[PDB]
Motif scaffolding. Structure first.
Motif: not given
Ligand SMILES: O=C(O)C1=C/C(=C2\C=Nc3ccccc32)NN1
Ligand SMILES: [Mg+2]
Length: 713
Positions: A113, A270, A446-448, A501, A527, A617-619
């Motif tokens: 992604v 992102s 996990f995040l959202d 991810m 991911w 690296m998180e979004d």
């Molecule tokens: O845990 C989640 O819901 C989540 C993590 C995540 C990303 C983490 N690094 C990224 C880099 C580029 C695009 C998305 C991501 N997207 N959704």
């Protein structure tokens, strides 16, 4: 300023020019008609879009009041049913989607992604369908740097040998020989349609000759041997004249893995895109990838050529089949406004424009450009942050109407349902049914999903710490529930079931050790943040037979609605004051560290050092979980208002120091109140409780536009 009027729409000139001059030509769609179509679709579907967004606020309002008048799970569940939050589960069905590429229906493997506004990263991703195992092993901590195997300015042959050995063992586990080990191989030949491998003494063939998939060069001495395992390809490059091949016992130069089978070019979390100019940069990159002529000063790769075991030629794709991730239902963007000056819904725009652009990817030409994305002629859009099956049906309606404006056959635009909102989780079977002829994908994260979890039950009491959330009952049931619903809907052999991810970009040893759990859990895909990570994660699909796993999981119902609805409240006296402080600082640095790059530099994904200097690296979703958690603790008096301010101020210089070595960076300390980033981070927390479903984009988009406007002089 400066817009083109089309019916009720006032289109930003930069957008208008881009569509006519760049996007439209080659699609054989009349520009006048397209813009009328836009005006029409927008007018027709905008009320619905608004109605859904209002329905979320209403639902949330009732859930808030309910909590304030109190836990009896039986009454709770009945309440969710009464208010139309929990809908009745539909009878069993199987999806009917057709014209779907093999990468999705059959192949299990990594999925990358990437933020679409970064052409460089986007280019690398498309070319990461194939990756060097050696480079991945050598370049990362998968091979420890210990016994004289540390990396340096120059190549370290001791480390190289460990790379070779690791690879040799991988070959043994994946494509085993009838006798002996690849470790002792001395040569490779093709005698009568069969791969012979020369050992010191005797000479063997594959345990399963079926895995021999082809070669290049003469059969008597190939330049490479093509292997296949669990649908994934492995290429052994043979070249004794190369430096590495010179010392290899069989002249092997490298081992190449089919890696990122699919990639998501991302218009959502992102990237930072708060106006018309931004959306255009994004759209242009998307255009180049589908044209197949995107390049940097370098190009997109072409298919690879081989020879079948018993003579004859064949071909394999060389690019990662591309999905695109549109924004969700919530935000508007000023790229188009109405005569009253109301911004147009961004999701509606994304469907129209990313869909228009993707036409080019169904065709190999000179007006459309040279390289083809989808071979069956589908467009793969991933739609984020939908709440419930009505919102899914709405997306499918949008897609249907866009297909008309574009003159595409109905059901051309496929949908990837992201399961990342509580109201989609508990009505998941119904959500898939609502897209039963378009769906090609579901996944978890996990995040959202946790941010939604915290926000939905905001009034119920204090939640457990963020680290604790990964092991809570609700999320374990959520993860398993997702797999069950997909398989029950017939996803195995028809569509992807994805998982989350790996965010720790530098801890590849750990990733290789632990991320195996995802395909073991039946995920046909998951991911990864980089091409390197895609190559390493590809090892897991070799070690694990996903098709067998899914088949064995069939018919099981491992999560109950009670489990799904188990709110992650903290038990009494759960934490010492030092623990509270640690959690606050943690979240504050998380927000400050990500916000500063977003607001000041329009950066949506990067290696951000955390509070202990771990690279993550998180979004944008990291902001949502972090801010909602603090807002929750604030609401229930776990922490005071002083507490939160003191932390942000402590963490700001640390984040400042962490960005040293970036000339573009501007410190937030010591003048916090003058820092737009510091204020954005403070607002996301203090106003967190009042944001719809905890979303961060209203605050963020506003602060980034404010920073950009301050920079206009
Ligand atoms: O845990 C989640 O819901 C989540 C993590 C995540 C990303 C983490 N690094 C990224 C880099 C580029 C695009 C998305 C991501 N997207 N959704
Ligand atoms: Mg998300």
């Amino acid at each position: 300023t400066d817009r083109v009027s089309v019916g009720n729409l006032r289109i930003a000139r930069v957008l208008y020019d881009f569509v006519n001059n760049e996007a439209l030509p080659g699609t054989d769609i009349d520009p006048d008609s397209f813009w009328a179509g836009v005006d029409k679709v927008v007018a027709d579907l905008t009320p619905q879009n608004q109605a859904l967004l209002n329905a979320r606020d209403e639902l949330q309002a009732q859930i808030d009041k309910w909590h304030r008048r109190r836990i009896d799970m039986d009454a709770y569940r009945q309440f969710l049913t009464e208010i139309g939050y929990l809908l009745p589960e539909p009878d069993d069905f199987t999806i009917t989607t057709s014209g779907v590429d093999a990468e999705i229906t059959t192949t299990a493997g990594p999925q990358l992604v990437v933020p679409v506004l970064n052409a460089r990263f986007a280019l690398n991703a498309a070319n990461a369908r194939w990756g060097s195992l050696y480079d991945a092993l050598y370049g990362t901590d998968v091979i420890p740097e210990t016994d004289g195997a540390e990396k340096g300015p120059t190549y370290n042959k001791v480390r190289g040998d460990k790379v070779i050995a690791y690879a040799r063992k991988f070959l043994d586990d994946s494509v085993p020989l009838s006798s002996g080990s690849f470790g002792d191989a001395t040569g490779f030949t093709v005698q009568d349609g069969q791969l012979v491998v020369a050992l010191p003494d005797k000479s063997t063939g594959l345990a399963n000759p079926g895995q021999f998939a082809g070669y290049t060069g003469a059969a008597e001495s190939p330049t490479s041997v093509l292997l296949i395992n669990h649908g994934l390809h492995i290429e052994i490059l043979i070249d004794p004249e190369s430096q590495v091949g010179t010392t290899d016992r069989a002249g092997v130069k490298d081992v190449i893995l089919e890696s990122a089978i699919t990639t998501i070019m991302d218009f959502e979390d992102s990237v930072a895109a708060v106006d018309a100019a931004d959306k255009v940069l994004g759209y242009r990159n998307w255009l180049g990838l589908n044209k197949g002529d995107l390049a940097a000063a370098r190009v997109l790769n072409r298919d690879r050529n081989y020879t079948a075991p018993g003579g004859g030629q064949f071909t394999l794709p060389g690019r990662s089949l591309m999905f695109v991730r549109n924004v969700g239902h919530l935000m508007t963007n000023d790229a188009i406004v109405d005569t009253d000056g109301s911004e147009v819904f961004e999701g509606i725009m994304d469907a129209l424009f990313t869909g228009l652009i993707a036409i080019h990817g169904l065709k190999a030409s000179d007006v459309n450009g040279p390289l083809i994305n989808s071979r069956t002629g589908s467009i793969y859009i991933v739609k984020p942050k939908m709440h419930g099956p009505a919102e899914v049906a709405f997306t499918c309606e949008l897609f249907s109407r866009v297909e008309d404006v574009l003159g595409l056959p109905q059901n051309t635009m496929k949908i990837g349902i992201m399961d990342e909102e509580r109201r989609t989780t508990v009505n998941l079977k119904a959500c898939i049914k609502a897209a039963a002829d378009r769906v090609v994908f579901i996944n978890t994260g996990f995040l959202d999903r946790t941010g939604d979890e915290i926000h939905t039950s905001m009034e119920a009491g204090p939640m457990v710490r963020k680290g604790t959330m990964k092991s809570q009952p609700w999320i374990l049931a959520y993860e398993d529930h997702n797999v069950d619903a997909g398989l029950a809907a017939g996803f195995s052999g028809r569509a992807q079931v994805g998982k989350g991810m790996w965010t720790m970009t530098e801890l590849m040893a750990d990733m290789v050790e632990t991320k195996i759990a995802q395909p073991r859990a039946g995920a046909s895909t998951a991911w990864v943040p980089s091409p390197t990570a895609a190559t390493l994660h590809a090892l897991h699909y070799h070690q694990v037979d996903v098709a067998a796993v899914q088949q064995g999981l069939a018919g099981k119902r491992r999560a109950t609605i009670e489990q799904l609805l188990t709110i992650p409240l903290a038990k009494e006296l759960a934490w010492a004051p030092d623990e509270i402080r640690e959690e606050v600082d943690n979240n504050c640095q998380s927000i400050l560290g990500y916000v500063v790059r977003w607001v000041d530099q329009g950066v949506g994904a990067s290696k951000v050092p955390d509070i202990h200097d771990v690279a993550l690296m998180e979004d944008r979703a990291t902001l949502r979980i972090s801010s909602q958690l603090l807002a929750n603790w604030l609401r229930h008096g776990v922490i005071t208002s002083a507490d939160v301010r003191a932390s942000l101020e402590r963490m700001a210089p640390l984040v400042d120091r962490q960005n040293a070595g970036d000339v573009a960076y501007r410190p937030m300390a010591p003048n916090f109140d003058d820092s737009i980033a510091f204020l954005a981070a403070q607002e996301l927390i203090l106003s967190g409780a009042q944001q719809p479903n905890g979303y961060t984009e209203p605050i963020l988009h506003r602060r980034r536009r404010e920073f950009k406007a301050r920079a206009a002089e």
